[PDB]
């Protein structure tokens, strides 16, 4: 029961789990009555969800993953924990390969966990191995890492992943586990269908929502002093501990380097000390600006997309300019409030920005269509931007807008965004943008 999981967790990996979801996922795999989908971030709790259950299963767990870099890093650690793991890749000498194929044909092989590429898992040079494993009831779990590579609406589509659906079907008796860090509901639809996962598919999706972050849009068009507004936002967010004076630090995001340089100046003039970070600076300059921010010499950094970090006391992230994508806005904005203390996330929206960026997306989508040809991904790129304009231009819980797009349940807002806090002033400010249209 739960009894065994605790001990095997402790005995081997030397652990309680990083979260109670990570827990619930792992337990479900173990019951092995169901396929399961795990969308968790790069915290790497996901790995345990298939690794631990593999040991308790008294058979072999195959683990499909797209590239060696990804595989190698784990197998090294898995060994170090004295666990019988094996990578099968064509970067391997014929002898090492053939050693392993031999091992797999043994009643009771050494290998517990086999890390394969989709290439090999597809190759007919491996199907007989696979057949014999199946027939000898030796396959405990099929695992597919980077599951999202099966989706053309995903950022990283791989035709090889299409063969994996056929594979799951052959390996019927075994539970299948799919993992990715990044899936829109459309990508989850593709994953469940393409990999022929079996209902009820149990899902363990890390929620986007963070209580301690306060989300609001401002319209640069409806604003006398934009620069002044920003400084007041920065002021409120810094000095949440006035006995210290200025507590915390903050990021301002811009599309262009000149915007950064200029906005750094305007802020510094108004009495909020900000230095610009962009690829335009010598590398030396960048390492120094990063330092000052990181060691609180300078409370505010003004940066382009090129921001290298993991500070805990980020009291605010302001987007001066709309981001290329909902996901990039989530990623970038979420650099705030890692310490768990209150933080402020603000988007400054301009229809001229929307237009300026909408074009640059399409222009850099065109540069790819010339380089390689058309992709359903190119539609998703534009869809990724459309979702953020909708975030700005509609009335609704800002947190819930994000959770809808990613595929989370309705979040526990608690007057944690502009619209949840005063629905009517948001109505006012939208109405206002319609008049100025």
């Amino acid at each position, epitope marked *: 029961p739960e009894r065994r999981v605790r001990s095997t967790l402790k005995k081997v990996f030397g652990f309680s789990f990083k979260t109670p*979801l990570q827990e619930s996922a792992t337990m479900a795999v173990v019951k092995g009555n169901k396929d399961v989908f795990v969308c968790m971030p790069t915290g790497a709790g996901k790995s345990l969800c298939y690794q631990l259950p593999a040991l308790l299963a008294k058979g072999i767990t195959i683990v499909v993953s797209p590239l060696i870099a990804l595989i190698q890093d784990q197998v090294d650690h898995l060994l170090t924990l004295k666990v019988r793991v094996s990578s099968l890749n064509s970067k391997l000498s014929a002898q090492e390969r053939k050693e392993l194929l031999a091992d797999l044909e043994r009643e009771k092989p050494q290998t517990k966990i086999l890390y394969i590429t989709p290439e090999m898992a597809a190759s007919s040079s491996f199907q007989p191995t696979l057949n014999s494993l199946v027939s000898r009831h030796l396959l405990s779990y099929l695992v597919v890492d980077e599951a999202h590579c099966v989706s053309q609406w995903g950022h990283d589509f791989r035709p090889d992943y299409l063969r994996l659906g056929a594979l799951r079907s052959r390996l019927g008796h075994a539970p299948c586990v799919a993992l990715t860090a990044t899936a829109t509901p459309q990508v*989850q639809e593709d994953v469940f269908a393409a990999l022929h996962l079996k*209902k*009820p*598919v149990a899902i363990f*999706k890390t929620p986007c929502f963070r209580a301690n972050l306060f989300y609001d849009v401002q319209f640069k068009e409806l604003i006398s002093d934009p620069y002044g507004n920003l400084k007041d936002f920065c002021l409120k967010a810094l000095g949440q501990e006035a006995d210290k004076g200025l507590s915390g630090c903050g990021i301002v995001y811009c599309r262009t380097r000149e915007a950064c340089e200029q906005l750094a100046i305007e802020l510094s003039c108004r009495g909020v000390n900000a230095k610009a970070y962009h690829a335009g600076l010598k590398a030396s300059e960048r390492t120094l600006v990063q330092n000052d921010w990181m060691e609180e010499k300078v409370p505010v950094i003004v940066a382009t997309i090129s921001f290298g970090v993991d500070k805990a006391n980020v009291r605010f992230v302001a987007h001066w300019n709309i981001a290329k994508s909902m996901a990039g806005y989530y990623q970038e904005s979420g650099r705030a409030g890692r310490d768990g203390k209150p933080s402020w996330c603000r988007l400054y929206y301009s229809r001229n920005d929307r237009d300026q960026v909408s074009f640059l997306i399409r222009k850099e989508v065109a540069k790819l269509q010339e380089k390689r040809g058309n992709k359903a991904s190119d539609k998703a790129t534009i869809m990724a931007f459309d979702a953020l304009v909708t975030f700005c231009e509609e009335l609704g819980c800002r947190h819930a807008a994000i959770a809808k797009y990613f595929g989370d349940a309705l979040p526990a807002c608690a007057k944690g965004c502009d619209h949840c806090q005063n629905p009517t002033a948001v109505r006012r400010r939208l109405e206002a943008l319609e008049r100025s249209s």
Partner: nanobody
Amino acid sequence: QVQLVENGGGCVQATGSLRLSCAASGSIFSINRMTWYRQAPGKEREWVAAITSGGSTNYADSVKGRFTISRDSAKGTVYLQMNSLKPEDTAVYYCEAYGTYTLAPTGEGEYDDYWGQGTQVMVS
């Protein structure tokens, strides 16, 4: 798990009208396809009409024009407006929640198909 429960059925006269309401319970995020089936006594289950998430609708020929399927997106509920009824239409009507994505704010979810309880529909 999830509940599909149908409402709005009864006995009505030929050339009359009903509007069926299919209610889906549980933490539903989305439903790929909701479809209306009717089971006439002594006949095979008949496919009536259906609506995709994003509102694409299609109808059996036997009911085109007479019937219309609709989504109160707000409500998370589908409706089959049946006008110009006939004794033929007499049957039990149920729903199929195909590709039903269910999610809690814990992160703990499912994806599965669900079948409705049914509601009686009699036409004199």
